[PDB]
Write a protein that holds these residues in place. Structure first.
Motif, PDB file in Angstrom:
ATOM      1  N   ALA A 194     -27.035 -56.188 -13.737  1.00 31.91           N
ATOM      2  CA  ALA A 194     -25.716 -56.699 -13.286  1.00 31.91           C
ATOM      3  C   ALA A 194     -24.551 -55.938 -13.918  1.00 31.91           C
ATOM      4  O   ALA A 194     -23.547 -55.692 -13.240  1.00 31.91           O
ATOM      5  N   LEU A 195     -24.678 -55.629 -15.206  1.00 32.00           N
ATOM      6  CA  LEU A 195     -23.651 -54.869 -15.949  1.00 32.00           C
ATOM      7  C   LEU A 195     -23.474 -53.489 -15.277  1.00 32.00           C
ATOM      8  O   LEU A 195     -22.342 -53.081 -14.974  1.00 32.00           O
ATOM      9  N   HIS A 196     -24.605 -52.818 -15.013  1.00 32.74           N
ATOM     10  CA  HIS A 196     -24.569 -51.540 -14.302  1.00 32.74           C
ATOM     11  C   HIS A 196     -23.786 -51.623 -13.002  1.00 32.74           C
ATOM     12  O   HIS A 196     -22.858 -50.787 -12.773  1.00 32.74           O
ATOM     13  N   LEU A 197     -24.143 -52.581 -12.145  1.00 33.07           N
ATOM     14  CA  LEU A 197     -23.489 -52.737 -10.851  1.00 33.07           C
ATOM     15  C   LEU A 197     -21.997 -53.024 -11.006  1.00 33.07           C
ATOM     16  O   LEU A 197     -21.190 -52.449 -10.264  1.00 33.07           O
ATOM     17  N   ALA A 198     -21.640 -53.911 -11.934  1.00 32.83           N
ATOM     18  CA  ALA A 198     -20.207 -54.230 -12.204  1.00 32.83           C
ATOM     19  C   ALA A 198     -19.407 -52.987 -12.619  1.00 32.83           C
ATOM     20  O   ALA A 198     -18.249 -52.818 -12.194  1.00 32.83           O
ATOM     21  N   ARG A 199     -20.051 -52.110 -13.383  1.00 28.16           N
ATOM     22  CA  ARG A 199     -19.442 -50.885 -13.875  1.00 28.16           C
ATOM     23  C   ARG A 199     -19.529 -49.733 -12.866  1.00 28.16           C
ATOM     24  O   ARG A 199     -18.811 -48.741 -13.019  1.00 28.16           O
ATOM     25  N   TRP A 243     -28.306 -60.802  -4.872  1.00 22.46           N
ATOM     26  CA  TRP A 243     -26.977 -60.677  -5.483  1.00 22.46           C
ATOM     27  C   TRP A 243     -26.075 -59.786  -4.659  1.00 22.46           C
ATOM     28  O   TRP A 243     -24.925 -60.167  -4.326  1.00 22.46           O
ATOM     29  N   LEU A 244     -26.587 -58.603  -4.326  1.00 25.63           N
ATOM     30  CA  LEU A 244     -25.875 -57.688  -3.443  1.00 25.63           C
ATOM     31  C   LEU A 244     -25.686 -58.226  -2.036  1.00 25.63           C
ATOM     32  O   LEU A 244     -24.622 -58.047  -1.464  1.00 25.63           O
ATOM     33  N   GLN A 280     -22.891 -50.441  -6.071  1.00 27.05           N
ATOM     34  CA  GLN A 280     -22.899 -51.656  -5.243  1.00 27.05           C
ATOM     35  C   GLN A 280     -22.789 -51.264  -3.790  1.00 27.05           C
ATOM     36  O   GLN A 280     -23.501 -51.806  -2.905  1.00 27.05           O
ATOM     37  N   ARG A 281     -21.867 -50.328  -3.522  1.00 22.37           N
ATOM     38  CA  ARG A 281     -21.645 -49.903  -2.145  1.00 22.37           C
ATOM     39  C   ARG A 281     -22.881 -49.231  -1.602  1.00 22.37           C
ATOM     40  O   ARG A 281     -23.304 -49.519  -0.503  1.00 22.37           O
TER      41      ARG A 281
END
Ligand code: HEM
Ligand code: HX2
Length: 396
Positions: free
Chosen positions: A247-252, A362-363, A257-258
């Motif tokens: 989750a941290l990776h995706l937030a950063r 989540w995505l 995410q895209r």
């Protein structure tokens, strides 16, 4: 004081429970060791070796014959209490108990559980989505693995709220509760499930392992207690830590995410690459024969600490190790997130499925998300490094 077989130039005071700078970045804190000798002796925590270069980490972790898994930890007394099966066994005994446990966790069973496990992740995601923010570690990462556990052993749907609350003592260890009290608390929580599944086997995880023989005879009740304690603890903090790092990776990385929302077919490959990229598990061994390594000799009775991060992220073992990329052609077994050799995580398949299902839900269910503007990301060290706060925000 320094034992005679430890060269002065190998001495460090590195504390594995609080590496310097770990609260800002767990990975950078451990990677400081790549600037020194590949095998160092720390004077902290009673005095012990630390493997500090990729090839050394990888070689010693796989030497199950000369470096025993019995000790569990550098903290005295911890292994003696927990007596985990199969985690703390060696040799033929280890093989005899690992066999039915691995059978319980085989890919066909993992695949069959995927819809139920996905439904658990979806339900938890949907409970958080309307808020527009969360403390992801306490609201999601530390909640999901226990919910999944209850699914794996197939507890009746009506008992889940009670069982979820009983479980909170164990997902988030507090204190002063001693190791003996934590062991007893786990056993007491697990006992009603074990009792039921040994008497009347269903088709859930515990039933399937416990209905198998060990070395041609039935499980004893105490072996069942030890094995079940290992399954519970082995899948709680590790999965929480990995899900938090993902989750941290995706937030950063809004670009990732895209990417994964546009191409959901890249989720399995992204789960493998993220698991390689963010390992936080370290293990202990005790020498039962002398072992030459990196130009020194680990002597019988010495403890050795093995951080998986210093294999996976050591640029001498993997090219551009901090890049998340899809052209590595790297089987998960070739890195050390799940360990190496005889003791390699039996839940490796299940963990990969949990991370994939997390990404899908989540995505798929969440809008674009980011770190909060005025709250920090903090981490901790210890044997399973993890985010301790991960404040996310999104437009609900
Ligand atoms: C992100 C998830 C996970 C990570 C990073 C992880 C990591 C590891 C590692 C490094 C080991 C090797 C330990 C050693 O050599 O001393 C291991 C072993 C083990 N893990 Fe996991 N694990 C994860 C998930 C799980 C799950 C979901 C379960 C079960 C529900 C599980 C249960 C076990 C057990 C029983 C062992 C002992 C295997 C043996 O000794 O032969 N793990 N895990
Ligand atoms: C005990 C600790 O060092 C490792 C525990 C993981 C392998 O579940």
């Amino acid at each position: 004081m320094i034992p005679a077989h430890v060269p002065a130039d190998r001495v460090v005071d590195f504390d594995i429970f609080n590496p310097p700078g770990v609260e800002q970045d767990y990975f950078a804190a451990w990677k400081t060791l790549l600037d020194g000798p590949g095998l160092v002796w720390s004077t902290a925590n009673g005095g012990h070796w630390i493997a500090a270069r990729g090839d050394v980490v990888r070689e010693l972790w796989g030497d199950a014959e000369r470096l025993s898994s019995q000790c569990l930890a550098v903290t005295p007394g911890l292994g003696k209490v927990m007596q985990f099966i199969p985690l703390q066994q060696d040799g033929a005994e280890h093989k005899a108990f690992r066999t039915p446990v691995m059978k319980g966790l085989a890919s066909r069973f993992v695949v069959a559980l995927e819809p139920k496990v996905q439904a658990v992740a979806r339900k938890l995601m949907e409970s958080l989505r309307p808020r527009g923010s969360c403390d992801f570690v306490s609201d999601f990462a530390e909640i999901l693995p226990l919910n999944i556990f209850l699914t794996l052993i197939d507890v009746p749907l009506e008992d889940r709220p009670r069982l979820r609350q009983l479980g909170v003592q164990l997902t988030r260890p507090d204190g002063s509760m001693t190791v003996e009290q934590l062991k007893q608390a786990a056993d007491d929580y697990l006992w009603p499930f074990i009792e039921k599944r040994m008497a009347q086997p269903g088709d859930d995880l515990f039933s399937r392992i416990l209905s198998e023989p060990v070395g041609g005879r039935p499980w004893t009740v105490d072996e069942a207690r030890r094995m079940c304690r290992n399954l519970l603890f082995g899948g709680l903090d590790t999965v929480a830590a990995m899900i938090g790092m993902v989750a941290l990776h995706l937030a950063r990385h809004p670009e990732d995410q895209r990417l994964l929302r546009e191409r959901p077919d890249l989720i399995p490959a992204a789960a493998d690459e993220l698991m390689r990229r963010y390992p936080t598990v370290a293990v202990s061994r005790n020498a039962v024969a002398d072992v030459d390594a990196d130009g020194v000799t680990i002597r019988k009775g010495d403890l050795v600490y093995l951080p998986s991060v210093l294999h996976n992220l050591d640029p001498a073992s993997f090219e551009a190790p901090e890049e998340v990329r899809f052209d590595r052609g790297l089987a998960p077994i070739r890195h050390t997130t799940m360990g190496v050799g005889a003791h390699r995580c039996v839940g490796a398949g299940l963990a990969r499925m949990e991370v994939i299902v997390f990404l899908r839900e989540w995505l798929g269910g969440m809008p674009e998300f980011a770190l909060a503007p005025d709250k920090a990301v903090t981490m901790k060290g210890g044997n399973v490094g993890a985010c301790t706060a991960l404040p996310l925000v999104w437009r609900a």
